[PDB]
Design a protein around this ligand. Sequence first.
Ligand SMILES: NC(=O)c1ccc[n+]([C@@H]2O[C@H](COP(=O)([O-])OP(=O)(O)OC[C@H]3O[C@@H](n4cnc5c(N)ncnc54)[C@H](O)[C@@H]3O)[C@@H](O)[C@H]2O)c1
Ligand SMILES: NC(=O)c1ccc[n+]([C@@H]2O[C@H](COP(=O)([O-])OP(=O)(O)OC[C@H]3O[C@@H](n4cnc5c(N)ncnc54)[C@H](O)[C@@H]3O)[C@@H](O)[C@H]2O)c1
Ligand SMILES: NC(=O)c1ccc[n+]([C@@H]2O[C@H](COP(=O)([O-])OP(=O)(O)OC[C@H]3O[C@@H](n4cnc5c(N)ncnc54)[C@H](O)[C@@H]3O)[C@@H](O)[C@H]2O)c1
Ligand SMILES: NC(=O)c1ccc[n+]([C@@H]2O[C@H](COP(=O)([O-])OP(=O)(O)OC[C@H]3O[C@@H](n4cnc5c(N)ncnc54)[C@H](O)[C@@H]3O)[C@@H](O)[C@H]2O)c1
Lengths: 349, 340, 349, 340
Amino acid sequence: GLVPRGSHMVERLGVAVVGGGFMGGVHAEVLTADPRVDLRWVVDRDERVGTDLATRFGARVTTTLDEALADDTVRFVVVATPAATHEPIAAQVIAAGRNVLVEKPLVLSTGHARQLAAAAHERGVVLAHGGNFVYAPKFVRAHELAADREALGTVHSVRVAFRTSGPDTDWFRSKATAGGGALTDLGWHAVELCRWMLGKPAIRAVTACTRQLSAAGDVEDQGVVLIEFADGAIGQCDVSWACPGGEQLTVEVIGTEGLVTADLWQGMGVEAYTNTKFGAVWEPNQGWLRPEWEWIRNSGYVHQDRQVVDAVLDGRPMTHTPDDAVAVVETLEAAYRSAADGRKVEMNA
Amino acid sequence: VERLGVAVVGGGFMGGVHAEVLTADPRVDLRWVVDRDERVGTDLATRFGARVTTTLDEALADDTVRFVVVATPAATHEPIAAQVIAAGRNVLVEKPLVLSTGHARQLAAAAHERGVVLAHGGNFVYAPKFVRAHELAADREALGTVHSVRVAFRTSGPDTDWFRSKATAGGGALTDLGWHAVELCRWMLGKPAIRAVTACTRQLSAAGDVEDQGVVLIEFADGAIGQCDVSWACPGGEQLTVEVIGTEGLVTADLWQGMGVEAYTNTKFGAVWEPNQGWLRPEWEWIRNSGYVHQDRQVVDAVLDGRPMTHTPDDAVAVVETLEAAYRSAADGRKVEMNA
Amino acid sequence: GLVPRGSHMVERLGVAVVGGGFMGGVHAEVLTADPRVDLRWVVDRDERVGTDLATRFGARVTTTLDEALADDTVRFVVVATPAATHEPIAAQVIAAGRNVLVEKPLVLSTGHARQLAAAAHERGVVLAHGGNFVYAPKFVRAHELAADREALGTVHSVRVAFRTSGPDTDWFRSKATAGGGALTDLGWHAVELCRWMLGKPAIRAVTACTRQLSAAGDVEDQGVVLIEFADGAIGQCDVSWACPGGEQLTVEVIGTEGLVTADLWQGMGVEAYTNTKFGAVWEPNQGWLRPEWEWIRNSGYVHQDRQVVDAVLDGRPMTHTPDDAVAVVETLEAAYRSAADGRKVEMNA
Amino acid sequence: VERLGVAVVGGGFMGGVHAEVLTADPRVDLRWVVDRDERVGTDLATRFGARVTTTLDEALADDTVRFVVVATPAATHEPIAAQVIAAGRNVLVEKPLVLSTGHARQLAAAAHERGVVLAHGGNFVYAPKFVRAHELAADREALGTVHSVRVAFRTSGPDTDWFRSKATAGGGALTDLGWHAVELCRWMLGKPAIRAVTACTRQLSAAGDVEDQGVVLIEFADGAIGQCDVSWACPGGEQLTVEVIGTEGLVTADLWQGMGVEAYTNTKFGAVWEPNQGWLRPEWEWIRNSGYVHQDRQVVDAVLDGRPMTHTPDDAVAVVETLEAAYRSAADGRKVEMNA
Ligand SMILES: NC(=O)c1ccc[n+]([C@@H]2O[C@H](COP(=O)([O-])OP(=O)(O)OC[C@H]3O[C@@H](n4cnc5c(N)ncnc54)[C@H](O)[C@@H]3O)[C@@H](O)[C@H]2O)c1
Ligand SMILES: NC(=O)c1ccc[n+]([C@@H]2O[C@H](COP(=O)([O-])OP(=O)(O)OC[C@H]3O[C@@H](n4cnc5c(N)ncnc54)[C@H](O)[C@@H]3O)[C@@H](O)[C@H]2O)c1
Ligand SMILES: NC(=O)c1ccc[n+]([C@@H]2O[C@H](COP(=O)([O-])OP(=O)(O)OC[C@H]3O[C@@H](n4cnc5c(N)ncnc54)[C@H](O)[C@@H]3O)[C@@H](O)[C@H]2O)c1
Ligand SMILES: NC(=O)c1ccc[n+]([C@@H]2O[C@H](COP(=O)([O-])OP(=O)(O)OC[C@H]3O[C@@H](n4cnc5c(N)ncnc54)[C@H](O)[C@@H]3O)[C@@H](O)[C@H]2O)c1
């Protein structure tokens, strides 16, 4: 083998999805493919958007989180709303005694993260966060090779590059609603991947640089973080919202005896060219392309959500815990401080 | 919730893979392993909690068994499959379905008459990456007129002895690897009829009496040319690539070198298929990525829900004929016309 | 090292170029960069084209081959005219006692090739042919590794693929003027590369398939040749005029212990993307590109012409001789016969 | 036809390369090899038919010598170059030109006053592939606003001992490799001014007292961010890549992994730099492709034909300052502002 045994048709878990936008849709599609899941509610401030998602999966639609929480069959809530709404919404879901999966970034301050985590534990519920790429099949494989100590020797370098042409919806570009720019949006993943590839060691210091390119908004479009891990390995996170030509996500680990690299979007092994356009391909879809296949599964969403559901229904302890989210949140806060005053920031947390 | 009782015949490498794939299906109950070698069958049975026997009829006496996977040497396929169908069971037969076109048509007809599912083990037409490439290649506006398809399949050759005997394998690389190459070529073009086949083969190793490499040029009805390039003599790692070229566009897909992970070591990687020293391109999820999971899900779906199959015994017959024509072409040094 | 010593400024060789089209221009540019070369004449039936090339290099222009041959300073003639004109023109250049470089394909029949070669030898002049890719730096390197017998073991497979979107000028698509289509135009190179990569062994048999896609003309757009070499290795030449997206040229050699591959146009190590267009790039020049650098030198034209000039001026014997051209010509003639009647053709020549 | 008399100082690895490159130039007469080790200098001299000495002044007493290549350890560069310029000779000094910004400005000024050519050994800005990438990256309509440049330069480290001594090398990887990284970054953007530099370094090996790896973030005047990533601790083969990203486009170039030749062997390739087992990506024409040939042709052109140089001592000063600022940043844990 080995093929993981298939879910498991038979338990029933009532689910609410809060935020029926892009990511709420992905989760709705991933969760409804799981035989154990009953999607009961879509919650959204925009009723048209909420309604469109709900009818697609035969859920009920509401604009009030409290209506869904009044449904006793709901035991699990997915929160995919703008970043600054995560903490109030997750705090209320937890207080109502429900399990909750919160999209990246968990919250926007170290305090909120520690306190949300303490509140979930007290309430005896699962708090899970949406760092999907550490569940991506390709990266899991690469993580396994990066852990071969005989093969790599002493690891000294890790690098994660994550580049897009930027967000589609407006809330991403305001601090008030988003917390920060590319460093928050993409840097979340890059920092989680870096830690993880190294075996989650303590971070000793951080250095960072950011720029805002776009006139719209008040957040950065690009950032580079230099992370100093406790063993002395240097991490780099290179993120950007101003990169054309298609999403890029790569991971590189370098030791004294070996190295491991992995490429998500440019490593799918399919190539195409056309003089006109490919209908079934994400724009840009003319000229030379490297088309994706199974983008949802290959980004890790399917494995993440299966393991979250396994944690709620079967008490199967998760690989990635609120401790990991807390570590990411303080790294990002340290990075923003470093960028602001042009100095290395010592960690301690 | 719908349980399906399954028996696996042949407890070797492929029986092992199928057993792994089917027992991951919540609908499936693996009840029997059948194998002529009792030690091999016992090992597989104890691993998956099934009964074991050396006699297929002991497993067919079990009325719970409604579906049988046949993963035995090529020449044993037809007698076994005929038996299974005669006993009213649905069957999946590993590639080379059969060695003769007459036998293929009989089995299909016998299966249709009995009202059972006959399925064949061409797993790579179910591989997720190839399935995506096939979708792109079907965009007529994007590709214009399709005039070339090429499938290269290269390995360092089989390890068990019966593969290199003509009596039991029915062929060498052209059969073992060519089955897939031809099925992929055909499929990438939307499955058009084949009009002619030219082929060249060669035996390299001294062991056995079958070819180690071969090339087939295929003339499809519309005039597009297919190339199938297969070999048991290629070092450095398995290769499987697909290429479709039209006047306005093209599509390529690479299975084993397009998996997007690179590694280097001065020593070795323990978790990697040898060669595991120096520069490597390691696989991940090789069973799923090769198409076995999707194949076996769609065959179980057919048996349970009557949901009609994408790849049919008609496809398998087309492949058998082509391989028959290719071996004749290789012997006669001439293009062979397909009156079928 | 090692860097080849630089030409050698000082000898003077008067040159005529016949055919001032695309390839006559390339040669004019390569030859005038050689300090030893004096480009005296451009000969072309079209005076405007001839004149445009000549003024660019300060040559004289004529429409009569005889005018250039009346110039005693001319000792070396480059023939870059349509394929069917090669034999008469080269026969006249040779008879006038001049050295001659004839573009691919040398001539269109085995007889003509043997007889042209015999005539040059009798006249004591160099006859050279324009198979440039066997001089391409990258392929020379690959040829050297393919000759490591310990590293490859027994070589059993060689493959050359050569694909373009087809010729620009009309004469290429008529048998009368061109001899044949892609199999002649591209197959010339593919067959020469195959032989060479294997150490130029005898060819025992040939099998071939061709199709005509285009309505214009009467020659084939695609062809595949299966070559059986004497040692038992199988060669493949895959050529096409109907391939979009940019020129492709690759070489693959496979043995029992190893393999060697090389990629000319997709192996240049430069990548680019733009949302608009790159001005300095060969169309298609939008979207994802793999731009060439030094395309003339990297295709081998510079090394070929330097070695041809070395042969004339310094008697330095050439690596690739008229014997090699004769072998290619009969392979192609065998291939066309095989395609015509659907049978393997045994060689003997 | 115009002959230029040359002396090479330092008969080691780089002196060897330069001697190879310059003697291929028909305009050049290599007359002297100078080296403190007589055996090393003698070996190089006998190979190229030059005179040999251990005393630079014996070679400067020769009035035929109009041009000197200095390929000695970093700390020896300034005293030697000063001597050569003081004697009225044109000079080419290998990378790290000098270790101090003051010294760089003196040499440039001394050279300008004497009326001679001072050139520095940044060969990769002359590499044909990078020169092409630089042309693409200069297409403003195609790239839009340029906001990122990244240069990664990775090796398994130097083999001679003086490289790992601060006294004689003036630095580790950040100096040895970083010189190129910074010069490439700067050049790819059209050579704008540098406003600030942040850096992090680390020593891995126990031997020596210099860093093995370092990263530099560079803030250019317009606001574009440069990254220079260098390391002596990277296995599997040398890497050198360049990346430029703008809002409308991007350009990347790969020197050692973008050479387009792939090989595999179960044994080894004799004609290949080790690692020469397993999967390889072999180099071809490494001297020319690294830029040495073009560099040395353009320096000889300058000396003979007064044809002004693309890369000037002003560029070298900019690089020296940046490296100075980077090492301070690495020590202080802070961004260093460039008031130059
Ligand atoms: N892990 C990933 O790969 C990934 C990818 C994209 C986005 N995200 C994250 O998911 C979350 C949502 O992102 P998105 O792309 O789906 O945004 P989106 O703008 O597409 O959707 C946001 C939705 O939330 C609704 N909404 C706003 N406030 C609400 C509220 N108080 N209550 C209920 N609904 C509300 C909005 O009407 C909208 O429908 C973000 O936190 C984002 O960072 C994660
Ligand atoms: N689709 C694929 O990717 C793929 C890959 C490998 C093999 N196959 C095919 O699967 C089939 C088996 O190949 P394999 O690699 O597993 O071979 P194998 O030698 O590993 O196993 C074959 C097993 O069948 C047993 N056996 C032999 N004759 C039998 C008989 N009459 N009745 C019952 N059992 C018998 C043998 O003891 C043996 O254990 C072949 O047809 C092969 O072509 C397909
Ligand atoms: N080795 C290579 O890489 C390569 C590439 C392209 C073409 N070629 C070959 O070079 C030759 C010319 O090809 P091209 O692309 O330059 O064609 P072209 O059509 O661009 O140029 C042909 C030129 O020859 C002129 N011409 C025709 N008949 C003439 C005659 N009797 N006397 C003098 N001039 C005459 C024409 O006016 C025209 O200027 C062909 O044989 C071709 O196969 C080789
Ligand atoms: N541009 C490049 O790609 C590149 C590559 C390697 C080295 N370099 C540089 O070239 C220079 C030499 O490096 P190397 O690898 O050739 O070192 P090396 O140790 O191989 O050779 C240095 C030589 O200089 C001799 N020498 C030492 N002190 C001397 C002195 N005072 N006077 C005369 N000779 C003296 C030594 O005997 C030695 O033979 C260094 O500055 C290095 O940074 C540049």
